[PDB]
Fold this sequence. Notes:
Chains E, F: It comes from Coxsackievirus B3 (strain Woodruff). The structure is cut from a larger assembly and holds two copies of chain A (59 residues), two copies of chain C (256 residues), two copies of chain E (270 residues) and two copies of chain G (56 residues). Chain A has 59 residues and is of the alpha+beta class. Chain A has helices at 33-36, 39-45, and strands at 10-12, 21-26, 47-51, 54-58. In chain C, the strands form four sheets. In chain C, strands 3, 4, 5, 7, 12 and 15 form a six-stranded mixed beta sheet that branches. Chain C has a five-stranded antiparallel beta sheet with strand order 10-6-13-9-11, with no helix packed on it. In chain C, a hairpin with a 2-residue loop joins strand 1 (7-11) and strand 2.
Amino acid sequence: KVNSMEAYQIPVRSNEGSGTQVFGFPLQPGYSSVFSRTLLGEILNYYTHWSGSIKLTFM
Amino acid sequence: ASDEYTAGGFITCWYQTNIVVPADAQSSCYIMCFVSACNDFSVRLLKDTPFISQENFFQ
Amino acid sequence: GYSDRVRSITLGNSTITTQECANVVVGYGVWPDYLKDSEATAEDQPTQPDVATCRFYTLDSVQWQKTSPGWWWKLPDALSNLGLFGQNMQYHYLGRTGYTIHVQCNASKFHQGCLLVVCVPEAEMGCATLNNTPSSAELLGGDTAKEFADKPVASGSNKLVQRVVYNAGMGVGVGNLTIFPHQWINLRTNNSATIVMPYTNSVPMDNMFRHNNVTLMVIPFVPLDYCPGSTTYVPITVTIAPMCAEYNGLRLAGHQ
Amino acid sequence: GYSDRVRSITLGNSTITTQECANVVVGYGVWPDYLKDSEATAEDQPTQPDVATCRFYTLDSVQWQKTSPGWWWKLPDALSNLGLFGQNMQYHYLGRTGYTIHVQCNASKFHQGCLLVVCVPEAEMGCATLNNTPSSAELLGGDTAKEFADKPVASGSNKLVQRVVYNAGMGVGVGNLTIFPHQWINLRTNNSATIVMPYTNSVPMDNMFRHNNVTLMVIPFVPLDYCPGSTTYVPITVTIAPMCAEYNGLRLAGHQ
Amino acid sequence: GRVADTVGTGPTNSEAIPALTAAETGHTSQVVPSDTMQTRHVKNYHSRSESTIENFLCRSACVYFTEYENSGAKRYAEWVITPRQAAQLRRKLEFFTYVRFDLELTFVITSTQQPSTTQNQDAQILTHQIMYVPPGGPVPDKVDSYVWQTSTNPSVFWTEGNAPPRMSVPFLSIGNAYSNFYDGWSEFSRNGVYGINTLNNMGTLYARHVNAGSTGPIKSTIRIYFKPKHVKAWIPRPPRLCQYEKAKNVNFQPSGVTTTRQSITTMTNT
Amino acid sequence: GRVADTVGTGPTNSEAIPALTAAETGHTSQVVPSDTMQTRHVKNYHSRSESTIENFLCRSACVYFTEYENSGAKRYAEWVITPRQAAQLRRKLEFFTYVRFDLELTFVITSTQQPSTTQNQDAQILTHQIMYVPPGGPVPDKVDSYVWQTSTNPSVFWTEGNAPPRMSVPFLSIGNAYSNFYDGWSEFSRNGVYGINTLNNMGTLYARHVNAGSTGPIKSTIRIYFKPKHVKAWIPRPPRLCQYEKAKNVNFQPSGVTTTRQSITTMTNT
Amino acid sequence: GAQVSTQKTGAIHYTNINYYKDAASNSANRQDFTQDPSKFTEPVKDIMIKSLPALN
Amino acid sequence: GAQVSTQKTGAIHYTNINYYKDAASNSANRQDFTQDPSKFTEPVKDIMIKSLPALN
Ligand SMILES: CCCCCCCCCCCCCCCC(=O)O
Ligand SMILES: CCCCCCCCCCCCCCCC(=O)O
């Protein structure tokens, strides 16, 4: 699916029971494949060290 | 860069309460995610980026 | 600009945001707090874990069905297996606490229903047979919701509790429970409800395992009614936050 | 009394009122304007048609389907056949302009969807084959929307542009396009979106036919999903208003 | 320049909702970590210095190199000036639509013997010449052609064993800045060359040996290094994704968005 | 800075007892030689300067060297940066648990011919390149690989016959100081690599010839030299005893406490 | 006609002089720290407040 | 913006100037003599007096 638009979409479906996991990914903004090609991902790869607070906005 | 010493953490998303949908409304939804750096963010030690490749000079 | 429908609560790490709700019923009007030194008894210095304790927990969500009678939890022992508040419970002879209960059940605009969230200090349940008393296993369960039973419980020689809803297990009128603090989850205009309970008890501090001083009850009055084709499964979820915990008399590990 | 959902824009004759929208993203923070005399070059006195130019135009509305990849327009040449702004484009060697883009797609509460309105200064599209370059006919069309293609374009000897969405034709990550100004049309909480673009270019003025400096893109991220029985055909419509136009160097009629 | 402080916060119960917003406005929320949790007062002495544009674009980089010999077919090397014939520099300039800066050139020249049967080869110190030819100027077709006199054109004489030569150049563009991306044709008929190739005429750069230097053949290597200074930038944009192909145009080969991994839950890369 | 004075003293008879104390308190007695005997007033102009940390740790030292050739299998040399691959420097830093300082690098490069039958060998001036690669960066697997362009990574071009090159580096550690000794694993399961090897990721250092330089084979030698500056230290400790074995860990071979001698009374070493 | 400025430290002065007649010969300026995020974040006409709901 | 200090003698001034913009480029500081043995010798809570018995 990385060759389609669906790479950016998170499926959410009505289940019959509660507590199922929607998704998860490690936090390694310069290494992990998730953030790798993101905007923040690119700028980091030029730099070795970083610190701060990453916001995650969901819609 | 990836190292086990400083490894960042984890992130998850769990159903708090199952999606409730009326009749005639679509069952499945989608959720898009965003990333940004707060105003305390900082970086250091510029380097090369492994992503971009090359073979011989472009023409 | 502002709205009364929306609320945001923050304790320690956790945070709970709700875009549809009502105000927050506070106790009898006493905002929870620490212990003033006028009423103190224990002469050891109390532990105040603060952020380690104060925060929100989420128990097991329980399904809600057309025939579902209701549910009850016992707060002093529910959390006992969760987090440091479960650990700091086992290692102390005394504790003092107050609870913020937050119940979350949402539905679309096409789902009828009404719930009742009451928080009952010292609910004392009867027994199936008249002579015996309930067993410690029946009144409680770890993090799990115990539920009522819609029709009378046949009385054998067992220790079972009396689960009839209309008596609410305490042998009172269920219609009268609103003297205690409460709120109405109503699928029409609401989504979630909230309660803040200060510390209520006869003595200034208490042991946690012996005496369960606060009971939580969710009783549907108007069952869930919806036309076919809409989603069937609507869970209810409860969130329970201790506030201003204190502890005394550190001892060895266990309860026995 | 007031509301943030509602907005009314008036330029010249035309007016656009919307009862559901968000705020108006303004450029990079520079409200468009005329040319100060410090940076001027052309020594002829500029024409300022004002109301004759500044006003809203409406291009051809384009259907939006479950599989529809997306669309792009080129602003400097779109309007070229419409109104005096099309006429005043052909008779001058120079122009300076800024754009207010207003995109309108509405749906009922039962229609899922999300759109992305970005306005990309100097979008330079590649070619199908690696050696050639796109033809002037493929990158453009009069008032008509050119659309992407969801799957890779087979590379022959043609001049066709590379229409894959996930590369967005510029060979970048489509997920990153938000650095440019943008807004989200979302069938949930929105109806229409709005952008204001000041004049961006390397040199203070420019020829209009040669250099298309501003590209508009609408890319659906979450396709249209709706249960049967609801209306099928949902169009998208674009509205484009020049602002503070100027012109220099009157010449004969044509482009060649 | 310094990072902002994170201000402490106690508990909160209130109708003000920092944790909520609407991204549909195209507005990145300013929320700071003190809003959604409890926070202790902390002073940060971290500095944003090394993230400034100047330190980002200013490093020497090898754009290109050639080979020219002491005898035979190719006796000199000619190159038109574009940054885009080297991958890793071109990418660093594609963040910014409009860039402005003053080049600082540095050349690095080396010599290499070539296999031959010539007898009694005895070296002498070679001397390299490097001539710049602004556009439209005369173009030498042979090493001894008169153009090498350099009555005007800036030229540099260099010698092996000395330090590498260096010269600085000011801002040469016609407009108010260089342009990395240009959408349009060179001809009012929308025909001819498309893309940024039309804007770029920088002239040409040449090099030659001054003297034969020995009897045996010798091949030389020259290397150019840009070092932008005084940089200013405008209108940032997404970094490039697909590998480069040609130096005259943005043409690319379609490639996936990212790398892949196993099922969404999986916490490790593959 | 100066030595303290020794104050004179006459005879003494008194119940105050300087000469006695209890070492069980872990308290080194401050007694000065004037207490247990008679002493004349003496001014000392001796200075403790050369015993300061700065003069102790600051001297250039040869940590390591490699060999890379002009042709054949090995055309470049790669080395990860650790001080511990050289005995006498590593020991000087093992007094102090936590050290802080700013390296000053200096390279010394030499060339050597190799025996061959190649005819008409005629040298030219070689040019060495030295490239630093902070961690995680791209790793060249071949001399002509694109990575050598050094669009960013700090790199040095050097020439034979000139002075040895030098560059200074600031404090690169993440924490508040380098750590010489680290007790713990890299993994929360107490598994994997044990010891200081986990803390140390400094990146990698590379070198190559720029040009072949002649027909005949040539082998080169590079040498690195640290010169700590601005030093600060904490928590001193006992010097190391047994000979070193590995560079990744403190492993040692058991050896006696000291050398020996004859019967306790014997006044001379053996 | 010298000038004095401050180095980059963490927990001093250096003397620089321009020797040439052309601006492009002067050394790079590494020290300009001025930053105003408002030109990318918050590009809206109506100023929005953190403490309030976005769409009221 | 020079500076003046004293050499190391026994029985004079030198003029130094920092030419670079980075602290790590400045010359080593050889002259800091500050010494306080109390952090290794005498690490006790109750201050002990030389002239008195240790354990009384
Ligand atoms: C010996 C004198 C040598 C002079 C070197 C002149 C080199 C000119 C550099 C132009 C810089 C980068 C510009 C890209 C041009 C464009 O695409 O518009
Ligand atoms: C050409 C640029 C060369 C740069 C040289 C960088 C060398 C880094 C030196 C690190 C120093 C001593 C550190 C030991 C590390 C550890 O064990 O934590």
